[PDB]
Amino acid sequence: QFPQFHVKSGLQIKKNAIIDDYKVTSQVLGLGINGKVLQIFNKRTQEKFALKMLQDCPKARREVELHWRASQCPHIVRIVDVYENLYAGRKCLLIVMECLDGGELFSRIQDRAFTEREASEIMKSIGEAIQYLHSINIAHRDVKPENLLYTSKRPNAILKLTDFGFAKETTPYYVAPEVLGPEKYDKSCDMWSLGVIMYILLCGYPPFYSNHGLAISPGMKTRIRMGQYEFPNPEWSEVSEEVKMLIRNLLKTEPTQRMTITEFMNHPWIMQSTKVPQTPLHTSRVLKED
């Protein structure tokens, strides 16, 4: 009767030199928050892995723990191992992650087209990682299209959230939430992120941009602060008011007016992602022309 299935192992950090277990190529996959990401190979099995190198420090020890916990969710890059070694005198955390060769979320989309129930299905996988994190009290804080990478190039590869460099811990049957724990509004901007991704998923471009030719709120910063965006044509022509209202409620300037991740998940559009109009979008096209 016991929720054994909720019991997961903690993270044992290895001290042995990572070079005993992997070949660490000098090739960079990219620069994550607070560390580079090289490609490494498993000396015993020859499989390919990603490696983030962090310099050991309090923020560093926060990222590993947070990311370790989040890893239990299938939509977040798996951690294979964490090493605490000595790089050139300095102490650092070496995070071994599973390989994601599927490419960015939008690269896949760009290479093709994309319907709206498709976009819904995608928006729901992302929401799944986000939902898991907020339920264990973690705000990712750097959710952006570019941190969502596909596992393989297969048609059924799964999308996974990466980079926990800005992640943050957020902390009677009739007690109100505000009394069981303060908790500011750091979750809240993960939701804003969801907003921007969804928008781009339906038309190929972002809602906020640079436009000095404007009269009011030239600056993109200003347009965001104000909350100045819209659903022009034809991109949004056949997109449902239902969808647009959902973006309206994720992209609200006032953190607290913003929709929570449970509301998001229970929304009909994400929930009934198999009754949603398979209406065509200009995403793929728009994306290619940039």
UniProtKB/Swiss-Prot annotation:
The keyword Oxidoreductase does not apply. It catalyses: L-seryl-[protein] + ATP = O-phospho-L-seryl-[protein] + ADP + H(+); L-threonyl-[protein] + ATP = O-phospho-L-threonyl-[protein] + ADP + H(+). Sumoylation inhibits the protein kinase activity. The active site is at residue 142. The keyword DNA damage applies. Expressed in all tissues examined. Residues 23-270 form the Protein kinase domain. Its EC number is 2.7.11.1. Keywords: ATP-binding, Cytoplasm, DNA damage, Isopeptide bond, Kinase, Nucleotide-binding, Nucleus, Phosphoprotein, Serine/threonine-protein kinase, Transferase, Ubl conjugation. One of its GO terms (cellular component) is extracellular exosome. It is an enzyme of class 2 (transferase). It is found in: Cytoplasm; Nucleus. ATP binds at residues 29-37, 52. GO terms for biological process: 3'-UTR-mediated mRNA stabilization; cellular response to vascular endothelial growth factor stimulus; DNA damage response; inflammatory response; inner ear development; intracellular signal transduction; leukotriene metabolic process; macropinocytosis. Activated following phosphorylation by p38-alpha/MAPK14 following various stresses. Inhibited following sumoylation. Specifically inhibited by pyrrolopyridine inhibitors. The modification Phosphoserine is found at residues 217, 273. Heterodimer with p38-alpha/MAPK14; this heterodimer forms a stable complex: molecules are positioned 'face to face' so that the ATP-binding sites of both kinases are at the heterodimer interface. Interacts with PHC2. Interacts with HSF1. This is MAP kinase-activated protein kinase 2. It comes from Homo sapiens. The lineage of its organism: Eukaryota, Metazoa, Chordata, Craniata, Vertebrata. The chain holds residues 42 to 345 of 400 of the full protein.
